[PDB]
Tab-separated table of C-alpha atoms in Angstrom:
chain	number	residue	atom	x	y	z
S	1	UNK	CA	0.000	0.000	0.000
S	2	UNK	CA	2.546	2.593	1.276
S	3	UNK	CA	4.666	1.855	-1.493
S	4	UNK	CA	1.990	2.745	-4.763
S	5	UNK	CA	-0.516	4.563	-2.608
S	6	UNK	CA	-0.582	8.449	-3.394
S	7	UNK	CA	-2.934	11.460	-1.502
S	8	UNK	CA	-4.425	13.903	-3.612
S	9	UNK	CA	-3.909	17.131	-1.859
S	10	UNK	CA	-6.089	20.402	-1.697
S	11	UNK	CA	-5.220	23.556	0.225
S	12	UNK	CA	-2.573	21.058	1.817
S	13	UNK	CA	-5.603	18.812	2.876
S	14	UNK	CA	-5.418	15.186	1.538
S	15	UNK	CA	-9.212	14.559	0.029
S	16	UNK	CA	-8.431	11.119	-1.394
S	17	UNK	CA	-5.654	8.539	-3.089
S	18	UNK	CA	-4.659	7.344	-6.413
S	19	UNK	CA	-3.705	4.252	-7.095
S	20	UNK	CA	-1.567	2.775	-10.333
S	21	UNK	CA	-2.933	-0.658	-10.955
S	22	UNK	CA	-2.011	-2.344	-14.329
S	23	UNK	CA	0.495	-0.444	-15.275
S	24	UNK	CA	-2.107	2.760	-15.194
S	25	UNK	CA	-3.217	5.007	-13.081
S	26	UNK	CA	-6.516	5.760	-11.249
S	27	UNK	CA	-8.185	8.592	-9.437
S	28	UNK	CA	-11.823	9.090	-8.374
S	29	UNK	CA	-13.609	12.256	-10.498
S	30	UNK	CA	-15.830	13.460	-7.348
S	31	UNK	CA	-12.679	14.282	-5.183
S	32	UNK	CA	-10.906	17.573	-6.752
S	33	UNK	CA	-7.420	18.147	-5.393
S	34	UNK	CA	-3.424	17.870	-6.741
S	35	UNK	CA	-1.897	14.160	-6.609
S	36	UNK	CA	1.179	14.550	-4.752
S	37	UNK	CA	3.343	12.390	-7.317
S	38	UNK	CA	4.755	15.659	-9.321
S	39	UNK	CA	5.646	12.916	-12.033
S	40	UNK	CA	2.098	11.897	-12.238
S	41	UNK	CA	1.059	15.568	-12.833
S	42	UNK	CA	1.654	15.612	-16.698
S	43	UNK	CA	-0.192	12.664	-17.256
S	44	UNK	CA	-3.485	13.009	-19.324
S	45	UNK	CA	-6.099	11.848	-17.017
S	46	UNK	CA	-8.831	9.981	-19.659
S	47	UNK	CA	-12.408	10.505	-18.085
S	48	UNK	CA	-14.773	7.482	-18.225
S	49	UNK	CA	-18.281	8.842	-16.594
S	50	UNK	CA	-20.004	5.931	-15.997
S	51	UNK	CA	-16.853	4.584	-13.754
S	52	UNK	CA	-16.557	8.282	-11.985
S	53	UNK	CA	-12.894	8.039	-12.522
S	54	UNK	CA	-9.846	9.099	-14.910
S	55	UNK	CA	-7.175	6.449	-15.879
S	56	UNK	CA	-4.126	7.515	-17.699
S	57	UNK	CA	-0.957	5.383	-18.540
S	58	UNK	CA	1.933	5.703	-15.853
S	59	UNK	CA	5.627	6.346	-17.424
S	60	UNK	CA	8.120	3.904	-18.294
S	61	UNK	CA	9.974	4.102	-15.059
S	62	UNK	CA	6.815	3.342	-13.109
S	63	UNK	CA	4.975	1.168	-15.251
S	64	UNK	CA	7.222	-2.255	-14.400
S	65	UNK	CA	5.925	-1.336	-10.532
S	66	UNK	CA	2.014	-1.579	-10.137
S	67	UNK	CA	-0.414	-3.175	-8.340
S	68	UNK	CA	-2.078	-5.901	-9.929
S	69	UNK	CA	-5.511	-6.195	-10.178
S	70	UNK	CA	-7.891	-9.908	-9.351
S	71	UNK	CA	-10.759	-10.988	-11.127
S	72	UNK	CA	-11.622	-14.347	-8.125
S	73	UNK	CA	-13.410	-12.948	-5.154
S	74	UNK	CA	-13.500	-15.875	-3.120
S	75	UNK	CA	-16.021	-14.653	-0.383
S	76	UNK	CA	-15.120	-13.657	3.480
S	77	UNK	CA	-12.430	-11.325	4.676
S	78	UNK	CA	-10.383	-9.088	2.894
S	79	UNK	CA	-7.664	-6.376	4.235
S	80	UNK	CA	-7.506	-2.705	3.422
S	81	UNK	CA	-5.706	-0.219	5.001
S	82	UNK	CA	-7.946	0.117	8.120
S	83	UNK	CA	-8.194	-3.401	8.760
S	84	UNK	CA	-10.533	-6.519	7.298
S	85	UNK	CA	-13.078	-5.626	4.797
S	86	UNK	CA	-16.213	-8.222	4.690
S	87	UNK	CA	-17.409	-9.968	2.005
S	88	UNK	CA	-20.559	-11.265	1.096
S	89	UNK	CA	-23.528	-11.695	-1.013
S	90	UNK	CA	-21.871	-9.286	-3.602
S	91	UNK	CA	-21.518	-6.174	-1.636
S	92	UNK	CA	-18.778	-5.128	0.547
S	93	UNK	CA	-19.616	-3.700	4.257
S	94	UNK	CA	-17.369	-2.244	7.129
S	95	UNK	CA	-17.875	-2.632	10.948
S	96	UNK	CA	-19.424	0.825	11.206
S	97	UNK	CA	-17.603	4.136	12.121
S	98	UNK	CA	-14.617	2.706	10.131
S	99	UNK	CA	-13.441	5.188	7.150
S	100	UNK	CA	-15.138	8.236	6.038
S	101	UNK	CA	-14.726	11.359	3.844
S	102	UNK	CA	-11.281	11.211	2.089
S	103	UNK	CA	-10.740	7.577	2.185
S	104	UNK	CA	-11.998	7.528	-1.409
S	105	UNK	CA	-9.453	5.678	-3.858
S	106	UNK	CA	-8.295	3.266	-1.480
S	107	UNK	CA	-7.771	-0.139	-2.823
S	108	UNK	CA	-8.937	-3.378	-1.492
S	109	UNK	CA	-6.137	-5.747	-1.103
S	110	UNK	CA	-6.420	-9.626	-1.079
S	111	UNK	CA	-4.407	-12.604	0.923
S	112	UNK	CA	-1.786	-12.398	-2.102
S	113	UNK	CA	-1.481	-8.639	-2.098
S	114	UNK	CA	-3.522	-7.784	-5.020
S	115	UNK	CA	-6.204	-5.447	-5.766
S	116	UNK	CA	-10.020	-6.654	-6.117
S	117	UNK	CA	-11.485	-3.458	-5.826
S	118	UNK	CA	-11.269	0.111	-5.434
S	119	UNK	CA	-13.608	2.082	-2.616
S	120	UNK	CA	-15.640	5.200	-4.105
S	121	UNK	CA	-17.680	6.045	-1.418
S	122	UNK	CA	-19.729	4.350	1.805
S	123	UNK	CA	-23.505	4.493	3.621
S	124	UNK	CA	-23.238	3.974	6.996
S	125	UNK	CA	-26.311	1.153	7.674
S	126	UNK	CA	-25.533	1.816	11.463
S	127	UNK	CA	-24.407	-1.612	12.084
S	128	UNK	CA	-21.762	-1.572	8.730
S	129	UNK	CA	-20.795	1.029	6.019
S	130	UNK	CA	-21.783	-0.165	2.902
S	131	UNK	CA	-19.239	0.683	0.753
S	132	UNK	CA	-19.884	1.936	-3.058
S	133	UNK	CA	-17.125	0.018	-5.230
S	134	UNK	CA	-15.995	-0.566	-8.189
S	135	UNK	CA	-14.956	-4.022	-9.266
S	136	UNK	CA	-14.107	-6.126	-11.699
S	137	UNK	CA	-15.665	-9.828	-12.696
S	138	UNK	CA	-15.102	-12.924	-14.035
S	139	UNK	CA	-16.053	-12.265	-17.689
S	140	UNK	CA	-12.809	-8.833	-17.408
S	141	UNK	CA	-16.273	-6.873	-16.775
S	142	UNK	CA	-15.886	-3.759	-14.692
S	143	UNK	CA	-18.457	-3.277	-12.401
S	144	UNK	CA	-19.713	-0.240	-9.981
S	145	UNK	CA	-21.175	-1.567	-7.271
S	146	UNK	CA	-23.051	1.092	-5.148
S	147	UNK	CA	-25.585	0.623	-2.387
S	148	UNK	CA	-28.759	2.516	-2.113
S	149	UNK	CA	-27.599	6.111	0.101
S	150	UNK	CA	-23.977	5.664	-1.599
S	151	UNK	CA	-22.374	8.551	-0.342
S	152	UNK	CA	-19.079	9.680	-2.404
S	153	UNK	CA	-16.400	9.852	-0.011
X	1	UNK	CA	-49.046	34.144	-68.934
X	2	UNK	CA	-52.056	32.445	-68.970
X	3	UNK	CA	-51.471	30.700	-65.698
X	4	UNK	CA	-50.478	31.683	-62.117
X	5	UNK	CA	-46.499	30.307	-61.172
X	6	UNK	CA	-47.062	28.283	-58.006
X	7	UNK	CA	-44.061	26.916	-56.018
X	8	UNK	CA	-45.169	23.243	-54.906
X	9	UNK	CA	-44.969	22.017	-58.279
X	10	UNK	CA	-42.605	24.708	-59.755
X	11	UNK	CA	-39.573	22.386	-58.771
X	12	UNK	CA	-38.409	19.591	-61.527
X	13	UNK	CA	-38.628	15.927	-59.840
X	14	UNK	CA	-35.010	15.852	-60.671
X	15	UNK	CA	-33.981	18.377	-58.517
X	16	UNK	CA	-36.751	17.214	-55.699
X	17	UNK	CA	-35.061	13.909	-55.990
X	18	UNK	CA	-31.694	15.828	-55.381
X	19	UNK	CA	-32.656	17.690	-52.492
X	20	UNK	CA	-35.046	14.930	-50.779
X	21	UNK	CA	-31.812	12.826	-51.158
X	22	UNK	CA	-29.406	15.449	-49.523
X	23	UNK	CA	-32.101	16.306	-46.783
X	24	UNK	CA	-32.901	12.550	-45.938
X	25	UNK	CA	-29.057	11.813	-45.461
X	26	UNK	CA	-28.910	13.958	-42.005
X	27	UNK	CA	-32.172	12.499	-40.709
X	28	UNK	CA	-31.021	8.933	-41.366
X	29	UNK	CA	-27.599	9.855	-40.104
X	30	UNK	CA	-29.524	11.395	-37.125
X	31	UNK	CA	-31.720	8.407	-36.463
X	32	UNK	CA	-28.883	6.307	-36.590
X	33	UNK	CA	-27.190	8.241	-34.080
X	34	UNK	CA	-30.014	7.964	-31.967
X	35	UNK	CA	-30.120	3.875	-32.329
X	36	UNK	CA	-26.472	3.811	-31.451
X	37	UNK	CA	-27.139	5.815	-28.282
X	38	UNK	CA	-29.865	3.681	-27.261
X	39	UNK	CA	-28.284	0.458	-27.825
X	40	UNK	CA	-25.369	1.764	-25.844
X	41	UNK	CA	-27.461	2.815	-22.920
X	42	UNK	CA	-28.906	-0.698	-23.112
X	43	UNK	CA	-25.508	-2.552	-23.233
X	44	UNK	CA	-24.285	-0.268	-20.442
X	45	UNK	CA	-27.301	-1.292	-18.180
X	46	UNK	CA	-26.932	-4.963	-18.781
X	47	UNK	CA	-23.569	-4.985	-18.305
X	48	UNK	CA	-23.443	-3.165	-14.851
């Protein structure tokens, strides 16, 4: 995580993080700020609407050291960066209270220390945080998951 | 002249065939544009 895991500043106030994944990098459109990477800066930042995030291809110096990304979700626990993330039934919760506003961009890691999903945005349900996501599948589909009262971090 | 000039039929069929043909063109283009968005939208939503 701490290794490919950049803030996006504003005023000097991180507002979310960017992630390279693929050999490309990733940042969520509702959060507006400055990715601290100044290398990262000049890259042109492709906008796909429907996934509410820009992707852009890292340089050639960066590109050989990237997350990977998972298709198999093999249901239960899963780590992230303030502890297990639960999985089940196609949606994944929080024990409630953990994350918030600025968490958004993330990843989800797996056992194996690869990415399975990226976290948008959350509703708390008062006993878990649903957590808006996007994903990927087993047929290479990206997929947005988002339960009802998403709220964008 | 023995008879008023009207302007329905005072344009040859050759040159209504002309300009039906280069007025027709958009609107098919247009309606095809439309299809392609809606097909889209549909793939997207199936696909989420």
């Amino acid at each position: 995580e701490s290794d490919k895991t950049f803030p996006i500043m504003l005023n000097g106030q991180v507002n979310g993080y960017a992630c390279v994944v693929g050999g490309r990098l990733m940042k969520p459109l509702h959060v507006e700020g400055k990715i601290d990477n100044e290398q990262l800066a000049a890259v042109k930042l492709k906008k796909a609407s429907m996934y509410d995030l820009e992707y852009g291809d890292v340089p050639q110096n960066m590109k050989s050291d990237t997350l990977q990304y998972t298709s198999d979700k093999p249901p239960g626990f899963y780590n992230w960066h303030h502890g297990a993330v639960q999985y089940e039934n196609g949606r994944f919760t929080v024990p409630r209270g953990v994350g918030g506003k600025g968490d958004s961009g993330r990843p989800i890691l797996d056992n194996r220390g690869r990415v399975v999903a990226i976290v948008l945005g959350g509703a708390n349900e008062g006993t878990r945080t649903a957590l808006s996501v996007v994903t990927w599948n087993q047929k290479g589909v990206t997929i947005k998951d988002t339960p009802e009262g998403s709220e964008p971090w | 002249h023995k008879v008023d000039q009207e302007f329905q039929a005072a344009v040859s069929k050759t040159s209504w065939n002309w300009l039906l043909a280069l007025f027709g063109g958009a609107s098919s283009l247009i309606v095809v544009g439309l299809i392609v968005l809606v097909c889209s939208s549909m793939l997207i939503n199936t696909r989420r």
